[PDB]
Amino acid sequence: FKCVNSLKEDHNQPLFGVQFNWHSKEGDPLVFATVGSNRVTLYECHSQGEIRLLQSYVDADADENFYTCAWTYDSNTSHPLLAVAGSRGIIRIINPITMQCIKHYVGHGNAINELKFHPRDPNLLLSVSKDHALRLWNIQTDTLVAIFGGVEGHRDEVLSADYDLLGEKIMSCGMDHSLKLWRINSKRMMNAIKESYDYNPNKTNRPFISQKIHFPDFSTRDIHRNYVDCVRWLGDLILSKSCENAIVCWKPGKMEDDIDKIKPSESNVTILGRFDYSQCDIWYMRFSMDFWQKMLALGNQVGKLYVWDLECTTLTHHKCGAAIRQTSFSRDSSILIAVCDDASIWRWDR
Ligand SMILES: CS(=O)(=O)c1ccc(-c2cnc(NCc3cccc4c3CCO4)n3cnnc23)cc1
Numbered sequence: 458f459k460c461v462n463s464l465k466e467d468h469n470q471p472l473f474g475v476q477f478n479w480h481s482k483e484g485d486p487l488v489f490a491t492v493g494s495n496r497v498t499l500y501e502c503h504s505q506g507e508i509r510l511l512q513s514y515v516d517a518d519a520d521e522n523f524y525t526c527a528w529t530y531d532s533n534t535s536h537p538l539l540a541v542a543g544s545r546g547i548i549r550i551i552n553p554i555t556m557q558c559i560k561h562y563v564g565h566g567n568a569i570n571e572l573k574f575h576p577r578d579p580n581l582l583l584s585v586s587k588d589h590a591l592r593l594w595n596i597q598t599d600t601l602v603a604i605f606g607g608v609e610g611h612r613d614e615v616l617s618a619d620y621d622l623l624g625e626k627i628m629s630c631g632m633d634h635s636l637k638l639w640r641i642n643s644k645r646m647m648n649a650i651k652e653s654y655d656y657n658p659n660k661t662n663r664p665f666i667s668q669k670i671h672f673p674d675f676s677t678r679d680i681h682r683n684y685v686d687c688v689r690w691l692g693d694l695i696l697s698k699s700c701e702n703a704i705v706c707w708k709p710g711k712m713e714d715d716i717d718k719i720k721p722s723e724s725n726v727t728i729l730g731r732f733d734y735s736q737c738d739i740w741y742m743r744f745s746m747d748f749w750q751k752m753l754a755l756g757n758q759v760g761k762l763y764v765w766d767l768e769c770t771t772l773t774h775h776k777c778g779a780a781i782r783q784t785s786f787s788r789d790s791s792i793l794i795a796v797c798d799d800a801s802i803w804r805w806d807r
Pocket residue numbers: 471473474524525569570571616617686687740741742743782783798
């Protein structure tokens with residue numbers, strides 16, 4: 458990788474999130490979104506390192522702080538859509554052509570830390586909050602499918618979550634040092650998703666009733682000893698990090714235990730590997746993987762970018778010295794974008 462371009466957003470506030478749109482066809486524009494302050498901005502990647510500003514969404518509330526964004530598509534037209542959320546605890550669905558808000562969802566009792574779309578169903582949106590819960594929404598029928606939390610749920614702010622390859626289960630993590638598994642291919646959850654598609658408030662005077670999921674299907678606090686701020690699946694294995702200068706590769710149960718045989722009472726975990734690094738000991742730093750899960754990237758608090766081949770390279774620039782909060786690879790893994798605390802954006806080409 459070589460640094461081919463850099464820019465700074467006029468607001469001068471930290472950029473907390475970045476995502477390339479992985480739903481665009483080959484030959485169509487390569488676009489990424491950034492979130493920081495009360496803004497969402499779209500950019501296009503052109504040849505010879507060129508980055509073109511497309512449009513921006515500026516929230517009516519000057520005190521809103523966006524923390525996360527995620528891309529999906531309309532199941533009938535295949536047109537892209539962008540979801541954004543932050544400190545207000547309000548989810549906004551944005552049309553990327555006009556950069557206008559189509560609709561919004563209220564409900565979480567505090568800030569939203571991460572948004573993720575289901576890998577098979579573009580209408581199923583997962584949100585994780587400071588209110589200690591996860592929520593699953595159906596954005597086609599505007600319904601709240603389920604709330605994951607309660608008696609055996611997280612006992613402090615939830616920081617991250619990820620669906621597995623097929624979207625049969627979710628792993629969540631947060632300030633309580635725990636990683637919790639929630640199966641969504643159960644008879645109860647499959648029926649609830651089916652019912653959310655049948656609901657229409659114009660054909661009944663009764664409200665849609667959400668599932669209250671009080672119990673996870675697995676839980677551990679034995680991987681990290683501080684806030685767990687990023688989790689991703691790697692097949693049936695899990696990659697997770699805290700502020701302790703390592704990404705840990707682990708699995709529930711003993712070495713030969715199959716993930717789908719794991720019982721909620723499972724007391725063991727198996728450590729498989731560790732990715733060690735330096736100067737990344739502050740809260741709120743995300744790692745990412747490329748589409749094919751062959752590359753892993755993480756920025757540090759002094760502007761250095763670490764890249765591992767999953768099948769370590771340190772990327773540095775004399776003008777890049779602020780904390781790198783999140784990174785994103787283009788679908789073909791030829792471009793890597795990094796966003797910083799000083800509102801700067803960095804483009805690395807392979
Ligand atoms: C410049 S400062 O004032 O020191 C500062 C630093 C960080 C944050 C901050 C960042 N991001 C999140 N939330 C979502 C997010 C964004 C990125 C990575 C990440 C997560 C959750 C896990 O990892 N924040 C939620 N509440 N505060 C923050 C706020 C102020």
